[PDB]
Design an enzyme around this catalytic site. Structure first.
Site, mmCIF file in Angstrom:
data_model
loop_
_atom_site.group_PDB
_atom_site.id
_atom_site.type_symbol
_atom_site.label_atom_id
_atom_site.label_comp_id
_atom_site.label_asym_id
_atom_site.label_seq_id
_atom_site.Cartn_x
_atom_site.Cartn_y
_atom_site.Cartn_z
ATOM 1 N N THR A 1 0.714 -1.134 -0.123
ATOM 2 C CA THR A 1 0.242 -0.022 0.224
ATOM 3 C C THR A 1 0.745 1.350 -0.051
ATOM 4 O O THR A 1 0.527 2.274 -0.689
ATOM 5 C CB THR A 1 -0.873 0.132 1.280
ATOM 6 O OG1 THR A 1 -1.833 -0.986 1.145
ATOM 7 C CG2 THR A 1 -1.787 1.443 1.090
ATOM 8 N N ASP B 1 7.078 -9.443 -6.008
ATOM 9 C CA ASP B 1 6.337 -10.511 -5.351
ATOM 10 C C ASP B 1 5.574 -11.535 -6.318
ATOM 11 O O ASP B 1 4.576 -10.720 -7.208
ATOM 12 C CB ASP B 1 5.274 -9.700 -4.550
ATOM 13 C CG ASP B 1 4.504 -10.702 -3.794
ATOM 14 O OD1 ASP B 1 5.112 -12.019 -3.819
ATOM 15 O OD2 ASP B 1 3.605 -10.332 -2.881
HETATM 16 N N1 LIG Z 1 -3.907 1.948 7.070
HETATM 17 C C1 LIG Z 1 -4.578 0.959 6.532
HETATM 18 N N2 LIG Z 1 -5.941 0.943 7.006
HETATM 19 C C2 LIG Z 1 -6.936 -0.072 6.640
HETATM 20 N N3 LIG Z 1 -6.408 -0.958 5.833
HETATM 21 C C3 LIG Z 1 -5.072 -1.137 5.477
HETATM 22 C C4 LIG Z 1 -4.122 -0.315 5.909
HETATM 23 N N4 LIG Z 1 -2.878 -0.576 5.297
HETATM 24 C C5 LIG Z 1 -3.044 -1.564 4.822
HETATM 25 N N5 LIG Z 1 -4.300 -2.010 4.655
HETATM 26 C C6 LIG Z 1 -4.969 -3.432 4.219
HETATM 27 O O1 LIG Z 1 -4.320 -4.347 4.960
HETATM 28 C C7 LIG Z 1 -3.591 -5.598 3.941
HETATM 29 C C8 LIG Z 1 -2.242 -5.567 4.140
HETATM 30 O O2 LIG Z 1 -1.465 -5.773 2.916
HETATM 31 P P1 LIG Z 1 -0.662 -4.662 2.010
HETATM 32 O O3 LIG Z 1 -1.250 -3.378 2.400
HETATM 33 O O4 LIG Z 1 -0.712 -4.849 0.751
HETATM 34 O O5 LIG Z 1 0.738 -4.619 2.653
HETATM 35 P P2 LIG Z 1 1.848 -5.608 2.567
HETATM 36 O O6 LIG Z 1 2.740 -5.469 1.409
HETATM 37 O O7 LIG Z 1 2.894 -5.515 3.894
HETATM 38 O O8 LIG Z 1 1.181 -7.231 2.916
HETATM 39 C C9 LIG Z 1 -4.351 -5.030 2.644
HETATM 40 O O9 LIG Z 1 -5.590 -5.788 2.312
HETATM 41 C C10 LIG Z 1 -4.360 -3.531 2.780
HETATM 42 O O10 LIG Z 1 -5.262 -3.160 1.738
#
Ligand SMILES: Nc1ncnc2c1ncn2[C@@H]1O[C@H](COP(=O)(O)OP(=O)(O)O)[C@@H](O)[C@H]1O
Ligand SMILES: Nc1ncnc2c1ncn2[C@@H]1O[C@H](COP(=O)(O)OP(=O)(O)O)[C@@H](O)[C@H]1O
Ligand SMILES: [Zn+2]
EC number: 3.6.-.-
Lengths: 313, 319
Positions: free
Chosen positions: B31, B55
């Protein structure tokens, strides 16, 4: 395998139990709980829960003041605590791994034996509230570490001339004698800490990526020491579905994740005793609340029926 | 003078060309990558941006709601942001596998197998894996005739993606002891060093860490910052994601969460006292997943202008 610590709490064969867990997972609480639970189910025997954390965690946990001298836990008949600073109470330390840990540990084994001498009452079992940092027990490798190093010397000292060898004139054979006298102390302990029926390590973790990863690293490290690892307690679980749906999507969300990892824990450690413990309302302090909590280490918690028990806390 | 708690100056920068985004644990690495990438592109329409992933899970695709692959493709709805997901290890095997076929029946640095020392000398595998990436990029810049002004690297979830920054010094040490293969080793130790000349320049490339405000993530993050310093890579910004400013009293109906918050706060203060010199940007925990260009950009906004739990509440609750 049963999802609890019953067989251990009940065991009559164990004398040394370690309780570790990096991160704010519940290492101390689990120590106390294991300690209380064991003591309560074996009134016949005597128990010692010792800590090393300078923070005096056992004191803060029970609401009492413990120190270098064993003191029965107010309200218990066979559970005594002891908080020591081994480090507080020879310099190859910053060179050869495990030398400081081996010494630091022997220091603990002394405050125990001497406390057993004064009060004339020997402890049947000691629950080790591992220190929150470093590698408390890497020393289990000291023996094999010194054998390899005192073979490097024997390979060079034998492949040289009277000049070179008899040239270096150091106050190091006062060392030669004490490294072997230690290499002996460690090994006699290793025959103890390496016996599955005598001593085991209990890991504590929360159901999140970093803690599963961290606890995985620990189990590896503990196997390399030949320490027995068969039980892991997954603390602070919040069974939010059975939670009478106290609303809050933010928590329902956390629960879905914990469940995702409980599944991994479940599939990755099928052979272990994976004990699931509930997230309580607040801190768990004092013998009374610690006891009420500790009960689910023996008989697996039931989020449906035992809910009413952790909410009176 | 205080170091602003945001990434404005980076997102604004016209000097950087290589930005890395890492963070072990489910903290928000992907994200944050997207967000940094979107925010940069939106602030500099005049330039072109590439957000690359490694990835195999195709996270950038699942993140944006589109399908990206080995070929760059502008993000639907953007003018200067293109993504690409590749498997450098895979393509490195297909390239090597075939080099072995052309050895028996006889990146030129593959003749036979320069890749066998992989399980012996650290950084050899990573140095090769990385060059494979620099190839698909230059190649994509050759066909679409449009070169990217800046590439945001969504670091891969595992291993040590950029240990190779040490390869140069590691080979010089080995080359002195052991003093075909020797020609490929030096040809490599030259490629890496010309890169270090780039990745080592603070104004050219920087790494931004992502972490949640918990004990294990803070220490994990410390571990990383140490590692990146050892490589000579610039580390000046840490993104502390998923914070839930529970005190806002808005929907604060929950105690369980109030508990979590007290903790995060406990560590935010450590992160704040330990990395005073860093850009420690605080990001809110949203309601659900943050996916799609629209929500991703609404969120990304708080990487530039530090979020205000009192005022900006209304913004993260529309997602
Ligand atoms: N600040 C936030 N608030 C709510 N949801 C989040 C937040 N940050 C990440 N997420 C969600 O949490 C999940 C974590 O994965 P991601 O964001 O891709 O990170 P990573 O690469 O570390 O796995 C995803 O579904 C993402 O959309
Ligand atoms: N499962 C739980 N549910 C609710 N509160 C807990 C739980 N476990 C621990 N706590 C509380 O959280 C704090 C966590 O620290 P502690 O249990 O001592 O573990 P550690 O050794 O990792 O510091 C304790 O002071 C305790 O009162
Ligand atoms: Zn809640």
């Amino acid at each position: 395998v049963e999802p609890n610590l019953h067989s251990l709490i009940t065991s009559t064969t164990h004398k040394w139990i370690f309780v570790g867990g990096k991160g704010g997972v519940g290492k101390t609480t689990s120590s106390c709980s294991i300690a209380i639970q064991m003591a309560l189910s074996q009134p016949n025997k005597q128990f010692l829960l010792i800590s090393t954390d300078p923070a005096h965690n056992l004191s803060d946990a029970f609401g009492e003041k413990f120190g270098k001298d064993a003191r029965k836990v107010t309200g218990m008949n066979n559970l005594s605590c002891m908080e020591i600073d081994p480090s507080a109470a020879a310099d190859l330390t910053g060179s050869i791994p495990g030398i400081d840990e081996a010494l630091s540990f022997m220091e603990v084994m002394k405050h125990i034996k001497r406390q057993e001498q004064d009060e004339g009452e020997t402890f049947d079992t000691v629950i080790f509230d591992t220190a929150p940092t470093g590698h408390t027990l890497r020393f289990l490798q000291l023996p094999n570490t010194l054998s390899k190093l005192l073979e490097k010397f024997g390979e060079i000292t034998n492949k040289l001339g009277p000049m070179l060898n008899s040239f270096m004139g150091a106050g190091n054979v006062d060392i030669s004698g004490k490294l072997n006298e230690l290499k002996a102390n460690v090994e006699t302990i290793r025959q103890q800490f390496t016996d599955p029926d005598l001593t085991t390590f209990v890991c504590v973790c929360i159901s999140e990526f970093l803690s599963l990863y961290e606890t995985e690293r620990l189990i590896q490290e503990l196997i390399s020491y030949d320490m027995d690892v068969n039980s892991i307690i997954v603390n602070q679980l919040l069974f939010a579905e059975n939670d009478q749906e106290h609303n809050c999507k933010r928590c329902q969300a956390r629960w879905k994740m914990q469940k995702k990892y409980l599944d991994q824990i479940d599939e990755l450690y099928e052979d272990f005793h994976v004990v699931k413990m509930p997230l309580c309302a607040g801190e768990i302090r004092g013998l009374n609340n610690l006891t009420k909590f500790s009960q689910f280490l023996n008989k697996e918690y039931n989020p449906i029926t035992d809910g009413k028990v952790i909410y009176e806390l």
